[PDB]
Nucleic acid binder design. Structure first.
Ligand SMILES: Nc1nc2c(ncn2[C@@H]2O[C@H](COP(=O)(O)OP(=O)(O)OP(=O)(O)O)[C@@H](O)[C@H]2O)c(=O)[nH]1
Ligand SMILES: [Mg+2]
Ligand SMILES: [Mg+2]
Ligand SMILES: [Mg+2]
Ligand SMILES: [Mg+2]
Ligand SMILES: [Mg+2]
Ligand SMILES: [Mg+2]
Ligand SMILES: [Mg+2]
Ligand SMILES: [Mg+2]
Ligand SMILES: [Zn+2]
Lengths: 37, 118, 422, 140, 80, 43, 157, 23, 205
RNA sequence: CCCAUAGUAGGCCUAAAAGCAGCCACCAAUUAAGAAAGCGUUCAAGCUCAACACAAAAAUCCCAAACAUAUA
RNA sequence: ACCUCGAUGUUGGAUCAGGACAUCCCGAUGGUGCAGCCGCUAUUAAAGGUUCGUUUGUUCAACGAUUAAAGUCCUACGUGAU
């Protein structure tokens, strides 16, 4: 998880989810794509 | 029934009650939910204390104030009681509480498709 | 900034400083090249002046110093003076500046200025800041004179440290911060090297004197196009790795390095150790030699001394493969020493022979073995060998459904293979 | 699975280009090259021939072969050994529309190659495009 | 999974679900997943009968079931 | 916490000031009076 | 502070009030407007010509086959004079009522592929379908006479 | 004309590929 | 020569006379280079500011790298840095005369085009890197086509026409109602409240 | 979301570079597919895509209490 | 150059430490060019801890030996009516 003010899907598998009050980019194939707002 | 007060919005989690014991590192900040779970009277007591004028009569007024978490009230206090003030907020009715007559009166606003699993 | 410069070359004729490998004309040419590299100004005038004693508050004997003073002060076009010396003490700088009414620069300051001007990456900026710290400490007097404002010993309050002394304290802390930052940079560069080290990429560090064609040679070897050699000096100011294939179909990382100049303070180049440690962590060192340049021997001495000061491993110092570039400029050049390859990067003449020689050197230096190995087809062993080693020839035995592959394999890969496919 | 190759009829040589890839899926390379040489004898010699081998899970061969390539065939028709470098301006041979028709007569007849379009236009257009891509001009 | 049979009457309506189920199950990817698994797309209300490798039968009457629901039940019973 | 540097209302970093509905209504009322003044001066 | 500053300078409170009062007020439209009230004809002619020319028509769902399997089926069909056709349902729907095919409406939904011919090789076509236990024969209408699959089987035999 | 639309589709695919080169 | 031309750090003939920082050259709407010329796309400056050689290099490198030379061309719509900005020595006390010329800038006013692009391309192909450059510019900026520029101008006109507010900054300032000219600036009589220093409020009517 | 056969491993270049190391050409078959926009392969193989079809953080301790709905 | 020149005593050190977290160690967690060991990076966490010495008046730095670590700061560069 890296903190980013602008969230970008870095591959087809990245998906956006608003959890615990903020947006997250989650990815299972490339976990390094994981971003937190 | 001060235990059964209701906060609008997310105040239960956002409203923070702050105090300082005086000793270093004695700054305590407890959310409304935590303070309510600890003391079932603190929320209303603090609200009244804040709203009362900030002079030397405030503590006497708070002495006149009586707070009870639940329906139970002491017998002497009950005998003292004179009038009951109307509740400031009218409690909305739940579906379980709505009568069938009211449900029938309220119209159906749309025809759901017959072949929808819902 | 648009500063016409008068070049002053002190020619030492006896005793220490009497170089036996270079001539004043060649040194003047090198200094002119340095200023032209610095760009934006040129040598309006040149003066080579004798100096029996090179170490003085005034580098020249009183007579020659007065002669130079007259010439410099009578020439109005001159805006600055570049004294072709390694480093000049603050007293000498102050006295010459006052006498000649101009700004005096030494080779140290000129190289520092070109670095500051053409440094792009933050790593380069930090390293040149470290290299500047000496020049700063030398120049605080002049730099903070106007801040000093002629106040001393009369104020009785505050930190007892004088203005000069507390400026020294501030510069001490500044240097400490810079050194801490370079330590962090060294750690980060180690992180970067980790992956290539684990994959056991053979690495060849290309070193040599400045403007030897190191970058051009790397471009020729790799076949890349984004690599841009320059006519200017100190063009390559960052250490970068470029992949290139050898005749044995082996990939090798050529590591480009900073150029080396003679007659410079060691600390200048040594301040780039944070990024030049990639040479220390190399597998082979390729020394490029602009044999066409008249000062080839002096450049050899300078580069060898610089490497020794950089403290590269002695085994790495040994086996340094020497290539003589720019041979086209010297028609009919015949290499004398053995184990030396003549090449012409621009014209790409001896590049094939150089590639073969450095391939052999890599095989010797990386503990890699060229051996024939029999594998079973359909067992993924062939694909594994392709991916984890450089295969050179696959002779298929159809009768046994197998194949003998001639592979240059490291010991680690060989062990992994023997365990994975018994 | 299906393995595609452009093996040259005479050049059935096991090993460098075929050995590894063929073995990876499980094969008898001797059998494969023997059958390919049988096909080479059946057809002219010394010419690339696309193949459509299907390595069955039972470890058996069904070699399917058809017409020679289009590029080499056109080069032979135009009398060229190596194709043009630019191929847009460089030209090394010319072929007539009649010759193109004649070669197409024996082209759209291979099952695997899918060239079974009844209209002559469908195939003549494709071969014309192939020639235009190559260093061959379409006469008249 | 062993065998799958889909029956429907196209001239009769309410067959879209079963037709799409057939087009999805017969998909070359699905059949290649288990070449042994045999489909029999008979046709003659609409129904789907799936016999699994363990001799277990699933019957989905797709008269009022969407193809998504039928396929989800089919996959759940595959997972078993 | 929550300090305004220097003096409120003068510096580069002033305490923010926000217009209330009351202030907006007052200004609009004055504007209406002045518009009527324009009309009565136009003749 | 200069008139032009690198930061948004604080406005005099009266200027702030002026800016607030003179803000753009969009026109409110009373009732929200939101809740107030070539190739196609080429294939039209193609479908009309197909219907007129073919004496027998059948349809199927050849969508579960591989590219090569579909190509092989097409080759087997071309071995006979029968021709397989693909058209979008979106434009096939009008044609049924256009050509007076009322019973054909609940037959072309989803993927649909036509098998138009004049000489029925239906016997060998069904034989070919048999070795592939899917891709059911779907109802068709020979010479303006709707035939179910049982009708096609009887006609074949 | 079938070929008109075929060429149109080819050009549209080219345009999409050019746009996607950077994406 | 489709690729964007190199811009020199300072004029070949350096200016000798230090000149004041007339910020009015940044203040207010732009009256020059406000329209397209030999191009269909551009970077519009929605605010005033000074462009340095660093900004020019950023623009040149980004646009040159990201453009297609055989199908796109770019052209500067802003002159090379000419206005000299002077800086005193670090830590110098106030007084002692004006500082020496340090850098050169080029002023840019709101509503001006900085770079203009054209060629066999549509907006979507260029808007990406044009927006990158605009975002990295020292003032608010936006990648705008001819169509989009006309659309935004027409939208501004439509808002001005149909605004339901009886009161407009233009009217109040011109009539000096409430005596607000005591608080306003003479420039405001022409800026109509849409400009504040170097900033242009586009939503402002 | 579904789906992807194929003139052919387009030529040249190279040991090989087959859509994809690089240069030229970029036509064309199918109802519908870039001589390929991305992964991937030493090269192939394989995976997709375009196509048909249906905002914030600092150092003593937060900082009125609270409140969304009774007619300007 | 805004308070203080009818005095607001000044750098280091001792003593006692209050506080912030932008965490050096200890806790929890995501990523990794995370095989393991060391690590690097980020989120959360300030309850607790954060060494002793040789020169040097030194804060620092260098060096020696350690440590889990020998954190960055604010406190009138905390604290001389101690
Ligand atoms: N290799 C080579 N370079 C030549 C020759 N003749 C001229 N040159 C010039 O040599 C220069 C070498 O530039 P680089 O290769 O960048 O220099 P370098 O050795 O990397 O050193 P730095 O400039 O300090 O990075 C270029 O300007 C070439 O044009 C020649 O025969 N061989
Ligand atoms: Mg270089
Ligand atoms: Mg204040
Ligand atoms: Mg698709
Ligand atoms: Mg004062
Ligand atoms: Mg004053
Ligand atoms: Mg006093
Ligand atoms: Mg934290
Ligand atoms: Mg201080
Ligand atoms: Zn991802």
């Amino acid at each position: 998880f890296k903190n980013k003010t602008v969230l970008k899907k870095r591959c087809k598998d990245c998906y956006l989810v608003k959890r615990r009050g903020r947006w997250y980019v989650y990815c299972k194939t490339h976990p390094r794509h994981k971003q937190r707002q | 029934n001060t235990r059964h007060i209701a906060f609008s919005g997310n105040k239960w989690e956002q409203k923070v009650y702050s105090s300082h014991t005086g000793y270093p590192g004695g700054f305590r900040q407890v959310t409304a939910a935590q303070l309510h779970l600890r003391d079932p009277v603190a929320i209303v007591k603090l609200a009244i204390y804040g709203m009362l004028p900030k002079n030397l009569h405030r503590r006497t007024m708070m002495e006149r104030l009586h707070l009870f978490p639940d329906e139970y009230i002491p017998e002497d206090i009950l005998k003292n009681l004179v009038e009951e003030l109307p509740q400031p907020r009218k409690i909305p009715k739940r579906l379980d509480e709505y009568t069938q007559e009211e449900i029938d009166a309220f119209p159906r606003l749309w025809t759901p498709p017959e072949d929808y699993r819902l | 900034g648009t500063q016409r410069v008068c070049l002053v070359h002190p020619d030492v004729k006896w005793g220490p400083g009497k170089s036996q490998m270079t001539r004043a004309e060649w040194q003047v040419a090198e200094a002119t090249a340095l200023v032209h590299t610095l760009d934006g100004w040129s040598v309006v005038q040149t003066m080579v002046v004798s100096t029996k004693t090179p170490d003085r508050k005034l580098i020249f004997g009183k007579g020659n110093f007065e002669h130079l003073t007259e010439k410099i002060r009578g020439s109005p076009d001159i805006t600055c003076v570049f004294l072709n010396v390694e480093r000049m003490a603050a007293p000498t700088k102050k006295e010459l500046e006052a006498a000649w009414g101009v700004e005096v620069f030494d080779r140290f300051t000129v190289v520092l200025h070109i670095f500051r001007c053409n440094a792009r990456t933050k790593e380069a900026r930090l390293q040149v800041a470290l290299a500047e710290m000496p020049l700063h400490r030398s120049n605080l007097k002049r730099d903070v004179a106007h801040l000093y404002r002629g106040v001393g010993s009369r104020y009785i309050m505050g930190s007892g440290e004088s203005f000069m002394q507390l400026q020294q304290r501030l510069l001490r802390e500044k240097e400490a911060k810079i050194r801490k930052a370079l330590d962090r940079l060294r750690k980060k560069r180690h992180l970067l090297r980790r992956q290539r080290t684990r994959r056991e990429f053979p690495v060849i560090s290309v070193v040599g004197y400045t403007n030897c064609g190191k970058t051009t040679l790397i471009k020729a070897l790799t076949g890349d196009a984004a690599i841009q050699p320059r006519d200017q000096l100190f063009a390559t100011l960052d250490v970068t790795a470029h992949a290139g294939t050898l005749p044995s179909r082996m990939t090798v990382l050529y590591v480009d390095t900073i150029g080396f100049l003679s007659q410079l303070p060691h600390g200048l180049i040594e301040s780039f150790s944070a990024t030049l440690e990639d040479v220390a962590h190399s597998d082979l060192i390729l020394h490029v030699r602009d044999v066409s340049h008249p000062e080839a021997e002096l450049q050899k001495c300078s580069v060898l001394s610089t490497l020794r000061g950089l403290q590269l491993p002695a085994p790495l110092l040994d086996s340094m493969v020497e290539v003589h570039n720019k041979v086209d400029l010297v028609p009919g050049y015949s290499p004398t020493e053995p184990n030396v390859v003549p090449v012409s990067a621009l014209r790409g003449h001896g590049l094939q022979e150089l590639k073969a020689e450095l391939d052999a050197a890599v095989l010797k230096a990386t503990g890699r073995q060229i051996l024939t190995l029999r594998v079973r087809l359909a067992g993924a062993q062939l694909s594994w060998l392709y991916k984890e080693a450089t295969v050179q020839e696959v002779d298929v035995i159809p009768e046994d459904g197998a194949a003998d592959v001639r592979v240059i394999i490291s010991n680690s890969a060989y062990g992994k293979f023997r365990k994975l496919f018994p | 699975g299906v393995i595609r190759a452009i093996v040259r009829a005479g050049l059935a040589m096991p090993g460098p280009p075929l050995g590894p890839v063929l073995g990876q899926r499980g094969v008898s390379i001797n059998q494969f090259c023997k059958e390919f040489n049988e096909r080479t004898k059946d057809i002219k010699e010394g010419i690339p021939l696309p193949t459509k081998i299907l390595v069955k899970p039972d470890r058996t061969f069904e070699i399917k072969i058809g017409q020679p390539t289009v590029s080499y065939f056109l080069k032979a028709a135009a009398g060229i050994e190596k194709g043009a470098r630019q191929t847009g301006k460089e030209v090394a041979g010319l072929v007539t529309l009649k010759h193109v028709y004649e070669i197409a007569r024996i082209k759209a007849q291979d099952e695997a190659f899918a060239l079974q379009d009844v209209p002559l236009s469908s195939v003549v257009r494709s071969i014309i495009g192939s020639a235009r891509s190559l260093g061959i001009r379409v006469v008249k | 999974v062993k065998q799958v049979r889909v029956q429907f009457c196209p001239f009769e309506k309410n067959v879209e679900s079963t037709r799409t189920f057939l087009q999805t199950v017969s998909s070359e990817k699905v059949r290649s997943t288990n070449l042994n698994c045999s489909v029999i797309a008979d046709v003659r209300e609409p129904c789907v009968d799936v016999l699994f490798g363990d001799g277990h039968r699933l019957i989905m009457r797709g008269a009022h079931l969407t193809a998504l629901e039928m396929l989800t039940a089919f996959a759940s019973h595959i997972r078993a | 916490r929550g300090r305004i540097p220097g003096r409120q209302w003068i510096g580069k970093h002033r305490r923010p000031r926000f217009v209330s509905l009351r202030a907006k209504q007052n200004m609009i009322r004055r504007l209406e009076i002045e518009a009527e003044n324009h009309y009565w001066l136009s003749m | 502070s200069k008139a032009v500053t690198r930061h948004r300078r604080v406005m005099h409170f009266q200027r702030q009030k002026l800016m607030a009062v003179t803000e753009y007020i969009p026109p409110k439209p009373a009732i929200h407007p939101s809740c107030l009230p070539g190739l196609i004809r080429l294939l039209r002619r193609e479908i009309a010509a197909v219907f007129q020319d073919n004496r027998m028509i059948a349809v199927c769902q050849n969508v579960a086959l591989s590219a090569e399997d579909k190509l092989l089926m097409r080759h087997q069909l071309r071995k006979h004079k029968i021709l397989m056709k693909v058209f979008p349902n979106q434009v096939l729907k009008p044609f049924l009522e256009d050509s007076k095919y009322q019973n054909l409406l609940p037959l072309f939904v989803g993927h649909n592929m036509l098998l138009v011919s004049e000489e029925p090789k239906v016997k060998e076509m069904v034989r070919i379908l048999r070795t592939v236990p899917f891709l059911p024969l779907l109802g068709g209408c020979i010479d303006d006479t709707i035939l179910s699959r049982q009708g096609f089987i009887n006609y074949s035999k | 004309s079938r070929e008109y639309w075929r060429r149109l589709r080819k050009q549209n695919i080219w345009r999409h590929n050019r746009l996607s080169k950077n994406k | 020569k489709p690729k964007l031309r190199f811009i020199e750090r300072a004029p070949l003939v350096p200016k000798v006379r230090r000149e004041p920082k007339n910020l009015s050259d940044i203040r207010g709407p732009s009256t020059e280079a406000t329209e397209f010329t030999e191009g269909n796309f551009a970077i519009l400056a929605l605010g005033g500011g000074y462009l340095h050689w660093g900004h020019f290099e950023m623009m040149r490198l980004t646009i040159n790298r990201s453009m297609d030379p055989k199908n796109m061309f770019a052209i500067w719509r802003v002159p090379a840095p000419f206005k000299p900005i002077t800086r005193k020595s670090v830590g110098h006390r106030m007084g002692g005369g004006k500082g020496a010329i340090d850098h050169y800038v080029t002023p840019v006013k709101a509503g001006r085009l900085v770079v203009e692009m054209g060629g066999r391309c549509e907006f979507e192909e260029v808007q990406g890197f044009l927006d990158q450059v605009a975002h990295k510019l020292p003032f608010a900026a936006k990648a705008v086509s001819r169509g989009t520029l006309e659309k935004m101008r027409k939208d501004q006109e439509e808002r001005e026409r149909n605004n339901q507010n009886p009161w407009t900054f233009e009217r109040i300032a011109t009539a000096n109602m409430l005596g607000i000219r005591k608080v306003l600036s003479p420039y405001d009589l022409t800026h109509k409240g849409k400009y504040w220093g170097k900033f242009y409020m586009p939503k402002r009517v």
